[PDB]
Design a protein around this ligand. Structure first.
Ligand SMILES: Cc1cc2nc3c(=O)[nH]c(=O)nc-3n(C[C@H](O)[C@H](O)[C@H](O)COP(=O)(O)OP(=O)(O)OC[C@H]3O[C@@H](n4cnc5c(N)ncnc54)[C@H](O)[C@@H]3O)c2cc1C
Ligand SMILES: Cc1cc2nc3c(=O)[nH]c(=O)nc-3n(C[C@H](O)[C@H](O)[C@H](O)CO)c2cc1C
Ligand SMILES: CCCCCCCc1cc(O)c2ccccc2[n+]1[O-]
Ligand code: FES
Ligand code: FES
Lengths: 253, 408, 197, 412, 448, 202
């Protein structure tokens, strides 16, 4: 039997049955899966801030109590009003309207586009902004490296660092995630006394107690250069430099 | 609640559109017209059928029957049709039994090629002579401990236009029989009761077709004789499924309706003058008589033939007088037999030992030029396996060697 | 220009057969003879270059969030639509050829049935969706990936033919050696891994 | 020796004991003394050249490179050491490394005034342990496969072990070398049957294993000079970072003139440093016909076309673009790979026409990986692997063209 | 005359070349026909030990090639009928005696050109001279009913130590001219008389053509000539014949009696006085070279060293298609580190030995393989000694791998065991491609 | 049933004896946690898809037979994908597009056309589980070696102390790249063919 009328009936019958099941899963779990993605970053933001958090309920409670996203305009360096909670900067950079093309000389970090408005997170403590977390990303040797930089109220001291997305080769370029290396970033000064970028990644180690010198990655100069460019670009005019300048003069407080 | 509705309708829309285009695609891209098969370019012999299936089924339905010893699957390779065009390329399985030269000549496996488009094929006129017959069982009396002689009568007295040493395919439907029902004469029942073979039973769920050599020569009109061997379970494997067709055949009695197909066969005597040596074994005695009788009765051949058949005792040796009369009437041909395990009641005093060894000592030991002879082998694999090497021990060539394997 | 860079990226730098392991099952099974592999390599190119653009049009038109209607997204239907569209394209192509283009059917028709679901066809669409590509961009990427895949299968077929003289140990002969042979092929194709084109 | 070997033949025979050791014994019997075998059919006279005279000849064509490479490796280590340490501090380092005080014990002074002999001795202490490890470990896999499979050990390993021990940095841990050779000997060669039955280069597949498996010890600046705590980039890496004027030897603080690069007075692995030595050695195996002159010619043409093309295009951000072709030849491992490792008969094309295409592809691929790929400092090894995979196609295309001519009866 | 020059090939400089002077030679008491020499022949003996035979009496027939008759080369009584493994007919030995012979029809010189094809075919088959022809695609005697439009008369011999045909032909100039005329009528198309630059008698028939070949050894083989004048294949079958047998064809028709006299070059490293000696077909080499070889263990070879059959035991007789006898030394001695020694007195196609420096040297080659049997490493030797427009490196791998289907495509049909001899001579792996080709070709005809 | 379900574990392995579902094996075995999750996804999808097809095998139209089975498999994976994206999100990201490829994976499609059709529902369900279990056995052993040597970890547990953490074992970089997966399966098959010569190829 190869009746056309019957064949359509089974095809439609199968479509309806599968459609109900698939549609229910897509909508029923939409809210739960959205929470999962946010929870992952929320934990990462807490990790760099130094606030210990374990457990999904713990992450939500600590994140709400202390962290506070705030939009910031790169060109002006001042705060902005909007949906800072769910401002997907990555997608904004892709869109031409919300992104500004970078010229060859300007694009020190080798990123094609930069979003018009960035997003930061103030680590409030007792109704007082203890530190500000800046999402800075730059081009590595293999892929794009994204990291969070913690800066004190003075806007000059680095209180931490973490790379939540990298694709460098493990052992050579993947050391950026090494706890020892990240813990070595604490205490460095982003800017010199002249208010210009000073953080450096010196090959073959750094002088003991260097204020702006950071030990480089062994045998991974190319990745280290990308890290240096990322800090240099994002600390300049096109980056959070204007915002950090406001932070230096008590912008947060 | 709201997005689900859009998803559900969209879900059906994309899938419904896809089936429509492909369903519509077939309607205007593939033809549903029936396929016509031309036999020998003869308008009378034209077969028309819908697409699907294999070529073998179409031929059988029309009426022309092709050998199907393996019943499909590309195992025996007997099915060979000269398809001039069409039928697609040749599958790897077909190449197993078909060489590059044969494939170039157009030979193909009907049971493997699938009818999908108009094609033309050439077949020899001898195939048209193949037909089915419902022969009444004249008798199925026992002749040996493990062999039976099935005598059949062709309806209306017609004779099968077959060549000496050919075979026919007997088809039996689903059934269930018991070895107890077998009517084993007490002469051959001694060994049957020794191992209690009567306990086994045969059950068939679907029709089964098997090949069987005929012991009657072409000029024997209106009778078919088959030396069917009993395919009892091996002693090391007693509980394994007993022989289905063999159990069915041994259960037959006089007057039973027997369905056969043919005539088939390729184990035919060559047309030369070189001496032919026949080596028989088990059920293989049937072609030997046909070849021997045909060379003397039909062909009247004066050539020099030497037939040696292996048996276990006097009761397992049969047709002694049939060949002895030929020896008296034909001294050019000589017949022999060897008893490996003569029994006390045999009173045997002639040849002793296995057939393969004895014949070489008496005939091929002193032979000046035994290489040129023609060797016809038909018997159990061990008898054939030893003889081929034993023949090859005498520096024999494989061009003349023609093995009639029974699959034992 | 952008089109030239994309085509080269999808052929050498981004090779589906080896870089991403897409469509390996047919990669090893049909790599016996170069002539067969080349015929298969042509089949995947047409399927990939006809499915990638069509799917891109479909995805943007309806499946893309906030495209068919404001506030509603049908991204969850991505897998079904891509495979559903691809399956129809393979079947329809295998039929029109047998009817209107006899000679083409014998060359490509024999291979389409195994490509109705092949990994490479589905993998290319999924990667394209994960990134932002225009219609013209997708055509080059779809065509580029096909050539890259066809390059790997042909290269493997040539090696296997060259191995007719080799004496592989029993057991490792057949499928086992092909895996090792394919493994060594990836080593040679990792030279371009560092190119950021 | 002839009598002892002949008599002991009874033991290794199937009847005698130690039959499992026949494969190893046949190696010694066929090595010390040539077989007394005679022709049984076909051409009753045979050419005097056998497979054993094509390995010793190649194995003797790298000796000039080996000896200078040993001298160069020692010279850099001694010069670098004095630059870093001096006075008593040098003595502490000398007594802390078995490569140093061993040289001192045998009479080789480690001071800045060491002669040629002392420098060469230091290199030997860094090359022989690697060569011994690969030979023993590599040979063990060669024998194991042949003994188990009851084959006769083919004479193709002496050229694979020496070439793998000449393309690795002097400061290579021994255990890595054992793994590197094991992958090359087993996975790439012995799994395909043995010599003449493979499609890849066993030596370059053993190094590619260490290249990706442990990139730390076969890349960077701390591995190419056998001096403790000395971080000096090689010539080609310095070109990428800066430019033609950035080539400076941190040891002596002297610019790398072309002659110095050509002679081989630059840091790097033992075998590749000298191009003059390879040219002298490679002239023999090419003159004798052992090494194809088409592949060498093909590589040179491929490198020149792309090297010149990149110069014309130019670039203001990538300094490697403006490197002249003559600088490409005498830097990295291009000279070594072109002569001794890209000319492997088995892994190359089997057709005269195919060889030219195979040779050109190596030149094009090698230049590209050096210029457009920043991840890898240089890609002569990876260029060869790419060409080996596509070598069968090049001959297959030629065969198809040839077959088409045959079916046309050569226009007759 | 259309001249073709071969560049890729090797000329073996073996010591002791023939003096190129025809000598009376010894007296032969035993003659034989080699049964293994003919390819794919299944004998059907017509005689038994002790049976007397005449000059052209049939000895045995061919089962696979009905109608082809092999006749004895000299009158006598059969003394032995040797049979090897699996009763393979090694040779049929005959003791020369008496003078009885079987005569045939004879015609004038001019009448040969216009002779009917059927008459010519019948004459050759009965006389047994038909066995000389060899179909190139498989090197088998042509079928009785088959015919070809290209017959090649190899009037040149570039084999090492071979005799110069010009010396032999000039003795039988009249017979040779009559020989071509008979062949000219027999062929449907043309007759190609391949020859060296020297001058040879010509046939006035338009079909007969002369082509001049110059260069190393491969230029002197029938297989090379066909590839340069008439590419053969499965559909296009071509024949071949040596100049010596052509003289026999002319003698048969011009006088009506078989002509079994032959001139064979008895030369080699261990031959005291190399020269050309008259003999009879299938002479007993044990008597031909008796009291003419230096003391020591030697190997007598029928035909050229590159292609020939060892003369030991039953096979110690001259071959039907062999017009040359070579004597070598059994090099069974083992020398220390011989595989790596200065190449003095060592010959090699490559320049890896000091021997090539001394131009014009002659090497007393022995039978030693100069190595063991190993894998085939293509160091480029094959391409230097294969002038045919083929891919020898890929073709030889196909034969080694036993890929019959692929060998045909690469062009294995138009070769023979005598064409791969040089490739066998220069193989670093010490393979034997002559035997591999024979196995491959037999498989194609057996199956195909 | 125990022997029937366990038969395709090594006797008829879909990767060793056959060639099916190899793309996921060579690209998911980087971490054992992903490999185990992938094995369960295929086992569940293979069984459920076969069961539905067998339960509706009688009415399948041969014209679009592929579409109907693809729709069932496609719908099943999408539902599975939502579960993975709801819980075990971290593993889901590592799986990447290959989670969608489970629809294409030759194991689910191959068995659907081979055994799910012309078979009863319950026997088809068992076959799907058996085939998935055999396929998972390849991933586990291949994944076990890759993670054990590639990073000195098993399911994230430090088995071999790495040098970067004051350990003694240097991670093997190649184990995390494309070639490592091919060689392990190439040698894993070799071991299987040795103990089971019945699968040797001629
Ligand atoms: C051209 C030709 C001509 C023939 N002519 C004759 C003839 O004239 N006479 C004749 O008697 N036969 C003849 N045969 C043989 C015939 O085809 C059968 O071999 C025979 O009839 C048995 O048929 P069967 O259906 O009972 O076999 P089956 O029922 O399949 O039995 C095969 C045998 O193997 C055993 N067996 C089956 N399955 C198993 C298992 N799983 N484990 C262990 N043991 C098992 C059975 O017990 C039996 O002994 C001929 C065959 C051919 C091809
Ligand atoms: C000219 C020449 C170059 C060779 N180069 C190499 C090489 O680079 N690596 C190697 O392992 N063997 C080399 N060999 C030896 C041999 O060819 C090789 O080991 C086999 O191909 C291994 O199967 C070479 C041999 C010759 C004659
Ligand atoms: C330690 C050896 C292990 C087994 C492999 C031997 C290979 C081998 C054996 C020999 O006798 C040779 C003679 C001359 C030149 C090279 C030779 N090679 O490479
Ligand atoms: S019927 Fe047996 S092969 Fe076709
Ligand atoms: S799973 Fe088979 S092609 Fe990918």
């Amino acid at each position: 039997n190869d009746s056309i009328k019957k064949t359509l009936f089974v095809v439609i019958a199968l479509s309806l049955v599968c459609s109900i099941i698939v549609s229910a899963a897509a909508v029923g779990l939409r809210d739960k899966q959205k929470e999962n993605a946010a929870l992952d970053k929320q934990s990462k933001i807490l990790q760099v801030a130094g606030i210990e958090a374990k457990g999904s309920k713990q992450i939500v409670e600590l994140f709400n109590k202390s962290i506070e996203p705030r939009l910031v305009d790169f060109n002006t360096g001042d705060f902005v009003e909007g949906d800072a909670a769910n401002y997907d900067q990555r997608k904004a950079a892709k869109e031409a309207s919300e992104s500004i093309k970078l010229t060859a000389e300007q694009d020190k970090a080798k990123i094609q586009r930069r979003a018009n408005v960035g997003v930061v997170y103030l680590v409030k403590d007792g109704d007082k902004t203890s530190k500000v977390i800046l999402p800075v990303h730059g081009n590595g040797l293999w892929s794009m490296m994204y990291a969070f930089v913690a800066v004190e109220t003075d806007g000059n001291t680095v209180s931490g660092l973490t790379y939540y997305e990298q694709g460098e080769t493990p052992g050579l370029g993947g050391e950026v995630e090494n706890p020892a290396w990240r813990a070595q970033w604490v205490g460095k000064k982003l800017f010199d006394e002249n208010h210009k970028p000073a953080i450096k990644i010196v090959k073959g180690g750094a002088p003991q107690g260097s204020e702006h010198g950071v030990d480089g990655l062994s045998g991974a100069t190319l990745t280290s250069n990308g890290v240096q460019n990322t800090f240099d670009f994002w600390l300049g005019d096109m980056g959070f430099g204007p915002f950090l300048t406001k932070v230096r003069d008590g912008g947060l407080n | 609640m709201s997005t689900i509705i859009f998803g559900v309708v969209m879900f059906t829309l994309i899938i419904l559109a896809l089936v429509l285009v492909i369903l519509f695609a077939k309607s205007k891209l593939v033809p549903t017209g029936d396929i016509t098969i031309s036999i020998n370019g003869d308008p009378e012999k034209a077969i028309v059928t819908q697409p699907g299936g294999k070529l073998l089924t179409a031929l059988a339905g029309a009426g022309v029957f092709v050998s199907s010893a393996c019943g499909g699957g590309g195992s025996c390779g007997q099915c060979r049709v000269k398809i001039k065009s069409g039928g697609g390329d040749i599958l790897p399985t077909e190449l197993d039994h078909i060489s590059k030269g044969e494939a170039r000549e157009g030979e193909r496996l009907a049971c493997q090629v699938a009818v999908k488009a108009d094609m033309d094929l050439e077949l020899p006129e001898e195939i048209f002579g193949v037909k089915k017959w419902e022969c009444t069982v004249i008798s199925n009396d026992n002749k040996a401990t493990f062999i039976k002689e099935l005598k059949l009568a062709i309806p209306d007295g017609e004779s099968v236009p077959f060549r000496a040493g050919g075979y026919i395919q007997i088809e039996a439907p689903a059934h269930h029989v018991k070895y107890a029902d077998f009517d084993v004469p007490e002469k051959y029942r001694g060994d049957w009761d020794k191992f209690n073979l009567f306990r086994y039973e045969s059950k068939v769920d679907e029709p089964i077709i098997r090949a069987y050599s005929m012991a009657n020569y072409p000029e024997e009109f209106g009778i078919i004789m088959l030396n069917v061997r009993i395919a009892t379970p091996p002693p090391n494997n007693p509980n394994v499924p007993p022989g289905q067709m063999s159990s069915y055949i041994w259960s037959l009695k006089a007057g039973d309706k027997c369905t056969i197909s043919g005539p088939f066969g390729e184990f035919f005597a060559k047309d030369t003058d070189a001496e032919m040596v026949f080596i028989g074994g088990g059920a293989g005695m049937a072609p030997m008589r046909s070849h021997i009788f045909d060379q003397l009765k039909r062909l009247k051949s004066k050539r020099k033939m030497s037939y040696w058949y292996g048996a276990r005792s006097k009761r397992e040796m049969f047709y002694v007088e049939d060949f002895d009369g030929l020896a008296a009437e034909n001294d050019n041909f000589v017949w022999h037999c060897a008893l490996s395990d003569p029994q006390p009641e045999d009173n045997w005093t002639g040849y002793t030992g296995f057939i393969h060894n004895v014949l070489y000592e008496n005939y091929l030991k002193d032979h000046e030029a035994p290489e040129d002879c023609e060797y016809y082998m038909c018997g159990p694999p061990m008898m054939n396996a030893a003889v081929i090497n034993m023949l090859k021990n005498l520096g024999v060539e494989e061009e003349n060697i023609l093995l009639d394997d029974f699959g034992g | 220009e952008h089109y030239i860079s994309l085509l080269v990226k999808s052929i050498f730098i981004e090779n589906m057969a080896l870089s991403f392991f897409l469509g390996m099952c047919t990669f090893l099974a049909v790599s016996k003879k170069v002539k067969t592999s080349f015929g298969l390599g042509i089949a995947v190119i047409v399927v990939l270059t006809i499915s990638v653009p069509v799917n891109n049009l479909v995805y943007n038109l309806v499946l893309k969030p906030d495209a068919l209607v404001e506030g509603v997204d049908l991204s969850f239907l991505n897998f079904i639509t891509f495979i559903g569209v691809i399956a129809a394209l393979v079947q329809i192509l295998e039929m029109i050829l047998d009817r209107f283009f006899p000679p083409l059917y014998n060359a490509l028709g024999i291979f389409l049935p195994l490509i109705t679901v092949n990994c490479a066809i589905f993998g290319g669409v999924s990667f394209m969706v994960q990134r932002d590509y225009s219609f013209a961009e997708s055509v080059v990427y779809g065509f580029g990936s096909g050539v890259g895949w066809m390059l790997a299968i042909v290269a493997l077929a040539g090696i296997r033919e060259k191995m007719k003289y080799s004496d592989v140990p029993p057991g490792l002969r057949g499928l086992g050696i092909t895996f090792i042979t394919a493994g060594l092929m990836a080593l040679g194709f990792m030279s371009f891994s560092g190119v950021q084109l | 020796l002839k009598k002892f070997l002949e008599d002991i033949e009874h033991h290794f025979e199937p009847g005698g004991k130690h039959e499992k050791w026949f494969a190893l014994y046949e190696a010694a019997a066929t090595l010390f003394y040539t077989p007394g075998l005679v022709t049984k059919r076909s051409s009753h006279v045979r050419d005097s050249v056998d497979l054993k005279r094509i390995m010793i000849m190649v194995w003797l064509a790298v000796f000039p490179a080996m000896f200078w490479g040993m001298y160069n490796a020692g010279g850099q280590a001694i010069a670098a050491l004095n630059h870093l340490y001096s006075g008593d501090q040098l003595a502490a380092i000398v007594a802390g490394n078995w490569h140093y005080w061993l040289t001192e014990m045998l009479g080789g002074t480690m001071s800045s005034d060491a002669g040629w002999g002392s420098k060469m001795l230091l290199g030997a202490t860094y090359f022989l342990p690697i060569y011994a490890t690969v030979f023993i470990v590599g040979g063990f896999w060669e024998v194991l496969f042949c003994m188990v499979r009851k084959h006769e050990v083919n004479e193709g390993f002496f050229v694979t072990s020496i070439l793998f021990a000449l393309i690795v940095p002097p400061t290579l841990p021994l255990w890595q070398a054992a793994l590197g050779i094991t992958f090359g000997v087993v996975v790439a060669k012995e799994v395909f049957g043995g010599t003449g039955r493979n499609f890849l280069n066993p030596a370059l597949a053993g190094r590619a294993f260490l290249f990706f498996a442990y990139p730390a010890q076969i890349s960077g600046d701390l591995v190419w000079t056998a001096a403790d705590g000395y971080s000096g980039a090689t010539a080609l890496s310095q070109w990428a970072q800066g430019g033609a004027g950035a080539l400076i030897n941190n040891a002596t603080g002297q610019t790398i003139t072309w002659m110095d690069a050509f002679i081989g007075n630059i840091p790097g692995s033992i075998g590749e440093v000298s191009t003059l030595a390879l040219m002298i050695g490679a002239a023999f195996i090419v003159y004798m016909g052992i090494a194809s002159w088409r592949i060498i010619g093909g590589v040179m043409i491929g490198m020149i076309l792309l090297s010149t093309l990149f110069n014309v295009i130019g670039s203001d951000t990538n300094a490697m673009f403006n490197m002249p072709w003559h600088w490409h030849l005498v830097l990295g491992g291009f000279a070594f790979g072109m002569f001794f490792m890209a000319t492997d008969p088995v892994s190359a094309s089997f057709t005269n026409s195919g060889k030219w295409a195979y040779g050109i592809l190596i030149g094009v691929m090698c230049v590209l990986i050096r210029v457009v790929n920043p991840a890898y400092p240089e890609g002569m090894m990876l260029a060869i692997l790419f060409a080996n995979l596509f070598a069968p196609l090049f001959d297959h295309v030629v065969v198809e063209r040839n077959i088409k001519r045959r079916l046309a009866r050569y226009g007759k | 005359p259309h001249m073709i020059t071969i560049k890729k090939g090797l000329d073996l400089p073996i010591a002791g070349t023939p003096s190129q002077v025809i000598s009376d030679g010894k007296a032969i008491k035993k003659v034989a026909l080699l049964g293994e020499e003919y390819v794919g022949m299944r004998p059907t003996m017509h005689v038994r030990v002790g049976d007397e035979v005449k000059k052209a009496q049939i000895l045995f027939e061919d089962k696979k090639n009905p109608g082809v008759k092999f006749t004895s080369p000299v009158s006598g009584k059969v003394v032995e009928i040797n049979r090897g493994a699996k009763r393979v007919l090694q040779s049929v030995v005959i003791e020369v005696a008496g003078d009885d012979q079987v005569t045939f029809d004879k015609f004038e010189a001019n009448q040969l050109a216009s002779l009917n094809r059927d008459a010519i075919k019948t004459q050759l088959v009965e006389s047994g001279l038909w066995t000389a022809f060899r179909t190139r695609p498989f090197s088998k005697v042509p079928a009785i009913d088959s015919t070809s439009e290209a017959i090649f008369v190899t009037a040149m011999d570039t084999n090492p130590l071979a005799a110069e045909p010009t010396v032999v032909i000039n003795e039988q100039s009249e017979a040779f001219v009559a020989g071509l005329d008979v062949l000219s009528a027999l062929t449907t198309g043309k007759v190609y008389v391949c020859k060296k630059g020297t001058s040879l008698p010509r046939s006035q028939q338009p079909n007969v053509e002369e082509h001049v070949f110059d260069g190393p050894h491969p230029a002197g083989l029938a297989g090379t000539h066909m590839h340069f004048l008439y590419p053969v294949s499965a559909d296009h079958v071509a024949w071949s014949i040596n100049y010596q047998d052509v003289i026999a064809v002319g003698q048969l028709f011009l006088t009506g009696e078989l002509y079994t006299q032959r001139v064979v070059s008895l030369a080699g490293p261990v031959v005291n006085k190399p020269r050309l000696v008259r003999t009879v077909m299938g002479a007993s080499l044990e008597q031909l070279v008796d009291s003419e070889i230096m003391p020591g263990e030697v190997r007598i070879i029928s035909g050229s060293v590159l292609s020939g059959t060892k003369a030991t035991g039953p096979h110690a007789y001259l071959g039907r298609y062999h017009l040359q006898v070579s004597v070598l030394r059994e090099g069974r001695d083992k020398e220390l580190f011989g595989w790596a020694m200065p190449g003095k007195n060592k010959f090699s196609v490559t320049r890896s030995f000091l021997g090539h420096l001394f131009k014009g040297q002659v090497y007393n080659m022995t039978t030693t393989t100069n190595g063991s049997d190993r894998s085939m490493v293509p160091i480029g030797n094959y391409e230097k000694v294969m002038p045919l427009d083929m891919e020898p490196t890929l073709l030889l791998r196909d034969l080694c791998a036993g890929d019959s289907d692929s060998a045909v495509r690469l062009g294995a049909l138009e070769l023979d065991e005598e064409d791969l001899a040089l490739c066998t001579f220069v193989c670093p792996g010490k393979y034997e491609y002559g035997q591999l080709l024979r196995e491959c070709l037999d498989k194609i005809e057996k199956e195909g | 049933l125990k022997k029937s379900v366990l038969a395709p574990v090594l006797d008829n392995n879909p990767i060793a004896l056959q060639v099916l579902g190899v793309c996921s094996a060579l690209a998911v075995t980087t971490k054992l946690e992903t490999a185990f999750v992938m094995t369960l996804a295929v086992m569940f999808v293979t069984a459920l898809s076969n069961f539905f097809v067998s339960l509706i095998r009688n009415h399948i139209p041969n014209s679009v037979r592929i579409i109907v089975q693809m729709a069932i498999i496609a719908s099943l994976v999408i539902v599975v994908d939502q579960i993975l994206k709801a819980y075990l999100y971290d593993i889901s990201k590592q799986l990447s597009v290959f989670v969608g490829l489970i629809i294409t994976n030759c194991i689910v499609m191959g068995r659907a056309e081979a055994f799910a059709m012309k078979s009863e529902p319950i026997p088809s369900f068992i076959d799907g589980i058996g085939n998935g279990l055999g396929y998972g056995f390849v991933l586990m052993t291949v994944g076990f070696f890759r993670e054990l040597l590639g990073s000195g970890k098993l399911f994230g547990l430090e088995v071999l102390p790495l040098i970067s953490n004051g350990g003694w074992y240097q991670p093997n970089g190649l184990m995390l790249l494309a070639p490592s997966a091919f060689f392990l399966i190439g040698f894993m098959i070799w071991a299987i063919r040795t103990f089971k010569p019945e699968q040797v190829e001629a």
